[PDB]
């Protein structure tokens, strides 16, 4: 009855943390994934391809996934760019999945978007005064949201008296069962929080309890796969700094 769902965001193309994650996170029954699959990570049509078969249900679309899809001619010092060679890596199977994703989903006690209810694809909530804007902006007991890259939650009277969100710890549970609440997993594949280690949620309805973790993952190797693609030096460095 009572089910156990992982939730995940900012994969970003990185393979080796989300393969840490998913051997992390144990026996769950189902995957919801916020978005952004790809950009800045070595590894983006892998991503895609493990994003797309493990959540069926609940995938939205981030603001990297969007840029990606842009088809371009190149004829050329463009081709300097790690946002242009993201978009080279994709074939048609990854192209026609991420045009696909819906920007938001609704569904039951929770609404699902890459950024904010109020702009989906595009804005970050990081403080209670955007917090307190999105709240009317969604009428779902809770909505969860990426693109910070970093792990969050405030209730709704917290955002509207202008209470700082709370930055979860490892391990932290958080009981949802009154009010309602804006999430934030934190990043799968791109931590800006200063911990390098992979970020993602639990989230247990029937339990009423959204629980965050953190899990160490084999940075040198995604940094050793990014140089072998030649990306460049500053994306592989902020990798083992968690920044
Ligand atoms: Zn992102
Ligand atoms: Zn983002």
Redesign the pocket.
Known sequence: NAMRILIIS?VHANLVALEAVLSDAGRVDDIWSLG?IVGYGPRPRECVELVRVLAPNISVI???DWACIGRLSLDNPVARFASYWTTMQLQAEHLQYLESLPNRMIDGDWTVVHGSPRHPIWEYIYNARIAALNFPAFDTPLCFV??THVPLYIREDEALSNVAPHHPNDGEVLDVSSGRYIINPGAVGQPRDGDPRASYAIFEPDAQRVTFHRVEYRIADTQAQMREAGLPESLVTRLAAGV
């Open positions: 900012d952004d981030g603001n990297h990426g693109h």
